[PDB]
Structure 1
Amino acid sequence: QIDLNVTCRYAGVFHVEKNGRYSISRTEAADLCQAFNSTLPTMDQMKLALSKGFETCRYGFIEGNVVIPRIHPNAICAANHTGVYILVTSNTSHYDTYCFNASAPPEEDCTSVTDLPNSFDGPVTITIVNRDGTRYSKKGEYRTHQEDI
């Protein structure tokens, strides 16, 4: 069973938490985004997302780096840095992910995500979990690297 918690989209950019916080690899992140018909964001898209009001208190993959977008300074979220803060030093490889959907509205889309459109045949119950609690489930798979499984 896999629970994927999603935020609102901002300029098409959203945060995905898979079950436990920080349990996704780089290769899984890419696979996951792919299941949403999305891609790992470029820095520039992430900068745009941020300027429209996107912030989280969780580190996550983009294309090339691990980042956390911050608008409002906070002691436990990136130590009061603001902007798209790049993670510099870490021992470990697992974080959350950000994904980018080019088809999303240009601003805040807080409507509910109701499908993992591009997931493939598999045995896992995959549940998408919105912040307002609304859920969509399907039996399938999205991971293409065996070590991720």
Structure 2
Amino acid sequence: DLSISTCRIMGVALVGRNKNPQMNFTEANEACKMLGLTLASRDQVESAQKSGFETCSYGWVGEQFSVIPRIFSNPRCGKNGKGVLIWNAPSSQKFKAYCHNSSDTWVNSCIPEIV
């Protein structure tokens, strides 16, 4: 089974396997596709981070590198960095995936508009 962000921010979800090993670049694209999504771009993860999205996992994006979005500093997540941090790695390296849902328009898929 796959782990997925409970609430997507600017259409972005972190997607990973429930146990290691995680996913090379090809596997990451395939995982998003199996969910009916696409691999997110760096720009899409940056937009999510600016809207409050952070994780403790590096994940593949469409530019063929991996990123981690960080808002608070934690030594276990991006070595206390803040921002969208980049990891240039071979396409064979295992990471999670950032997927983008083009049907999302709410900033947070769990927070509706006022009804």
CA-atom RMSD in angstroms: 1.8
Per-residue CA distance 1:74-112 (angstroms, 9 max, x = gap):
11100111111001468x61111110001113311238x
Q: Which residue of 2 aligns with 1:46?
A: 45
Alignment of 1:1-149 (within 5 A): 3-7=1-5, 8-64=7-63, 65-88=65-88, 93-110=93-110
CA distance in 2, matches of 1:67, 1:88: 9
TM-score, reference length from structure 2: 0.84
In structure 2, C-alpha distance between the alignment counterparts of 1:16 and 1:29, rounded to whole Å = 8
Distance 1:21 1:108 in 2: 28
Structure 2, unmatched stretches of 5+, are none
More strand per residue: 1
Q: Give the secondary structure class of the aligned counterpart of 1:44.
A: helix
Distance 2:4 2:62 in 1: 19
Gapped regions of structure 1 (runs ≥ 5): 112-149
Q: Quote the Cα distance in structure 1 between the aligned partners of 2:104 and 2:80.
A: 30
Q: Deviations over 1:119-139 (max 9, x none)?
A: xxxxxxxxxxxxxxxxxxxxx
* Paired residue total: 108
d(CA) in 2 for partners of 1:85 and 1:15? 15
Residue identity over aligned pairs, in percent, reads 37
Secondary structure of 1:80 counterpart:
coil
Counterpart AA for 1:85: L
